[PDB]
């Protein structure tokens, strides 16, 4: 149960980022420009902040005492205290293109993305709406309204305790597998944000987990999150084999999927489905003859 | 640390000028002719490089020792290069008028816009002018030519060291994005001009930096560059919500701004804004009852 | 003869596997993050298992009843069993990170890690592999085929008795040796993948035992598995001491040697073996004086 904000939090965070941000300048990183990219990430965080502040000048105490931005200010302190304690650590090892500390670096890039997105989602012009964020699938909204009221955020066990009465969670190991997934600022909290981008990504709601387990954990064609170059290159190496595909999170996109796919003329076209679930996209177009061969295998999972 | 230039240089940019213009008129594309219009600015620039070498004729070893110069002809091929390879890695998603790589020509265009402007202002008619610059801003022309005297053209960290000792700027995130603002052409150093629009656009000189702060970080009103067009297009639908207004720039218009509101009897005005200040101009629009509803929202700052 | 796999054997497994994971996020244990980690191999041996099961839905009968797939879930039951009844009879001295129950909780999270590479190398992508799987070194394979056919896994005593017919093994207690260096999984069977292995770090096959009594019996330069901060932290007592060289395996790239040593410039640096043979790239590097003093010990083994 974390700490009222005041602006000496606020302060320290940005001589924190700040911090981060004099890291991450270093021209030995060569660190590439493309999404996510925390030399942006971190002064349009600060923007957005400076942007609540504004709107809460009579009210600093109403702000301050938010349980939403309570817990986020408390998460974007510790992940900013990640990424120094990384650096210093890591060493050398930094300006190595892909040891396991410069891995690491990408993956809390990836969460100040998220964590930004969230942000500007629960405070849209820097107002609090969590109390009002449209839940986008019908049947997911009903879940939350029922379950948690107009919370905005939900500590992970009693999201996972409410979601289990309704769609039976099989063991602790995929409880934890769920939990990376949904919790994509790894706070150990569930928002209402993140709980729409997962019910998103994952209809119907009728069989969630199923589409989950099938789209996400066992699908040869799942990439994660990856930018649009990062999937030409990777069929590039199938040019010759069409109907190769594979099927991307995008963090500039969140709750949508991008479908890349080698044609029969040698091209690499994507496709973002609006129109269907992505498991139907799936059937779809493999019956249609484009998604044959995923990441270039032969054979191809059977959704039906 | 820029290299010296001359004709040989000069016809090499021409050359990569010559490449983006025939990019830029594939029919494919459908280039809009709003501001800011590619297909125009290319010709004009390369129009008043010519000018600039007719005057320099055979003291051309004083015009290409000349530091804003330097400056600037390595911008423009760092420029034009760029667009040249976001054409190449966009291929097809060039022609998606939202693509994320279409959006990345529209900001390109915005650069080659103010870097004419800017030349333009440095050489009219051809010659250099730059160390006799007209600064707008009284107070302005004074912390100028004190901290700088006849410099045109000053690194971004001089600069930001200089203007720090009046202006106290709090953090390493908000010198970021205060450049962002200032530096226009985007090469890491502010020129007399570039430090003239913004004096304009956030005086009075002695709040400059909050005047910054809550005009055009904070404020829901502020558009960044618009045209006029999509000024009404926007408050179109605020008609029927009488006091909503919006305030943006204007690529054709350095260091001005303008007003797009909804009046009582439903119509779209703009304005622009007479002998005061954007600030004391929103205050009174406000006091008088026009200006109330910053982008349709019912809460507008309070700037007083 | 180890029996069927069905879903209630690998649901047995899940609850197991479970345990393990809650036993080991205990805080008071402060788990470190580094190689072998077993709160990340658990949920990657279940994601790799569920992808298993999900290629084989229609054939269950076919998945439960190959030998390898028996061999190595009874033997996942047994090491999670084992690990569960560490913590039962360590109690609080768990918490104590150089106690012999937590020296054993490292040991048995190597093992962790040499199973989840051994099922992915033979079932790659959820699939079977295993009788066509390829080992690298063809008179290494060779063997196996003479001796096992397309067998993917050998009982230690027909593999022992194999070996010995082309590569005498000179005592039971130097097979015992060689024992512990080969059955990484440590269920008392060889398969193909941790045969692939051996040969590889202990080439040439012409003089297997030899290569392998020099480099790992009898060398105080060999470390057995080791991370590259732990290189760092051992040399670090030689810094003044150009050319204190250790050599080491790693439980992320199975089957390939690393080298840390001493440079004169007073630096630790880190190869990895140069494409040639340990054996080789030790006298050349000798050679070269980079590779002089053992662990830091005047005499060098003589290899040569
Ligand atoms: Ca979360
Ligand atoms: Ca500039
Ligand atoms: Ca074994």
């Known amino acids: 149960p974390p700490g009222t904000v005041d602006k000496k939090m606020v302060e320290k965070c940005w001589k924190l980022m ?11 990183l060569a660190l590439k420009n493309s999404p996510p990219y925390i030399l942006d990430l971190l002064p349009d965080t600060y923007q957005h902040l400076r942007t609540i502040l ?28 990640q990424t120094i304690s990384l650096f210093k650590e890591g060493k050398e090892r930094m300006y190595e293109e892909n040891s396991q500390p410069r891995r690491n670096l990408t ?12 942000l500007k989602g629960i405070f849209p012009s820097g107002l609090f709406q969590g109390d009002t964020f449209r839940i986008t699938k019908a049947d997911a909204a009903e ?29 602790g190991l995929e409880a934890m597998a769920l939990k990376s997934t949904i919790d994509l600022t790894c706070n150990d909290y569930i928002s209402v944000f ?83 679930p992505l498991f139907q996209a799936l059937i779809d177009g493999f019956r249609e003859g484009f998604y044959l061969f995923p990441d270039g295998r032969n054979q191809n999972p059977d959704l039906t």
Chains 1, 2, 3 share one sequence.
């Open 18 to 28: 700040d911090k981060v941000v004099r890291l991450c300048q270093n021209p030995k």
């Open 54 to 81: 504004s709107r809460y000048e009579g009210k600093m105490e109403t702000l301050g005492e938010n349980e939403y931005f309570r817990v986020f200010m408390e998460n974007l302190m510790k992940k900013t205290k």
């Open 107 to 118: 993956k809390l890039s990836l969460i100040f993305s998220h964590m930004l997105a969230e």
């Open 143 to 171: 879940f939350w309204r029922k379950a948690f009221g107009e919370k905005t955020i939900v500590p992970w066990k009693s999201f996972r305790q409410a979601l289990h009465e309704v769609h039976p969670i099989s063991s």
């Open 194 to 276: 993140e709980f729409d981008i997962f019910t998103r990504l994952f209809q119907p709601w009728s069989s969630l987990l199923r589409n989950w387990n099938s789209l996400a954990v066992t699908h040869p064609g799942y990439m994660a999150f990856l930018t649009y170059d990062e999937v030409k290159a990777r069929l590039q190496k199938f040019i010759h084999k069409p109907g190769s595909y594979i099927f991307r999170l995008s963090c500039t996109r969140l709750g949508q999927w991008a479908i890349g796919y080698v044609t029969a003329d040698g091209n690499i076209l994507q496709t973002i489905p609006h129109n269907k």
